[PDB]
Amino acid sequence: VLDGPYQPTSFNLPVDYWMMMSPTQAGRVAEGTNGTDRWFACIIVEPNVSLQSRDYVLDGQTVQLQVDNTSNTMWKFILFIKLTKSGNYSQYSSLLTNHKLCAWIKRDSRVYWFDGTVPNSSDNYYLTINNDNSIVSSDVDFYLIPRTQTDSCRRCINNGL
Amino acid sequence: VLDGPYQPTSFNLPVDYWMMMSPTQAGRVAEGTNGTDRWFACIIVEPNVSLQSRDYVLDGQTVQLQVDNTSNTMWKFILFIKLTKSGNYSQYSSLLTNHKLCAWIKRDSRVYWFDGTVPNSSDNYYLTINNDNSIVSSDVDFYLIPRTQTDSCRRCINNGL
């Protein structure tokens, strides 16, 4: 039994809690920041998308990102990060899935993120945030799964609900 | 029995031939272009690498690209693409491997590229080039594998030689 779903919102995501987001449409999914040197955001791209430029509102600004999805059946989350307040976002991670679920966690001064392609996704990607009070914003419904139950989260990522 | 290894060189890679490169050092691996609107390149990043800017020479220009490798035991190939002559390169694909083998092919107006994390890699990523005479350059040793033996190439990528 899963703790959720919660409505889109901004809050101080408690540490050691997986935030598992469930978007329905292509576009921005969620963003978060530590305030100093990490502005992260994940977007989702529908199947079968040729290399193209799309506008997204990240950190309150319209930025233009070139995106891709070479899968014909799976949606693709992309994890973008910018390292300065006025810098550009670059792609650092992605998640391929037909369940349209992704998840990140504030743990051990990092943000961990589920990688790869289902049903073989795992919490392999991370970035250092060094801020347990980092604020996260979700545009879509999400669930909270404690760190001790990471495996459960993994199963949800790879098999759906 | 694989055709190779071949010495580093530049040439018009014949269509329907997997070009499988095997570097030994971190840094640039190979480049290629269709000459008009697509310049691609693959670099390789050693294990255990934090977010940083590294220097590469791509299309004859020294550029800074943001790289990471969150694996403790595998090297990470990264596929960068530049979409206009005056533009920048951005990451669009990657391959996690402890065998330090990557491969791309010119087929069906496209370049296909081995994706994911071994031993589950496959030729999932592609970009359109629309030029069968696109020129390719490799800084490292490489092998040629016919398209009819794609799976053999796949096995190499996932299992070594």
TrEMBL record, chains A, B:
The chain holds residues 64 to 224 of 772 of the full protein. This is Outer capsid protein VP4. Belongs to the rotavirus VP4 family. GO terms for cellular component: host cell endoplasmic reticulum-Golgi intermediate compartment; host cell plasma membrane; host cell rough endoplasmic reticulum; viral outer capsid. Residues 2-161 form the Haemagglutinin outer capsid protein VP4 concanavalin-like domain. Outer capsid protein VP4: Spike-forming protein that mediates virion attachment to the host epithelial cell receptors and plays a major role in cell penetration, determination of host range restriction and virulence. Rotavirus attachment and entry into the host cell probably involves multiple sequential contacts between the outer capsid proteins VP4 and VP7, and the cell receptors. It is subsequently lost, together with VP7, following virus entry into the host cell. It comes from Rotavirus A. One of its GO terms (biological process) is permeabilization of host organelle membrane involved in viral entry into host cell. It comes from the Viruses. Outer capsid protein VP4: The VP4 spike is divided into a foot, a stalk and body, and a head. Outer capsid protein VP4: Proteolytic cleavage by trypsin results in activation of VP4 functions and greatly increases infectivity. The penetration into the host cell is dependent on trypsin treatment of VP4. It produces two peptides, VP5* and VP8* that remain associated with the virion. Cleavage of VP4 by trypsin probably occurs in vivo in the lumen of the intestine prior to infection of enterocytes. Keywords: Capsid protein, Cleavage on pair of basic residues, Coiled coil, Hemagglutinin, Host cell membrane, Host cytoplasm, Host cytoskeleton, Host endoplasmic reticulum, Host membrane, Host-virus interaction, Membrane, Outer capsid protein, Viral attachment to host cell, Viral penetration into host cytoplasm, Viral penetration via permeabilization of host membrane, Virion, Virus entry into host cell. It is found in: Virion. Signal peptide: none annotated. The keyword Signal does not apply.
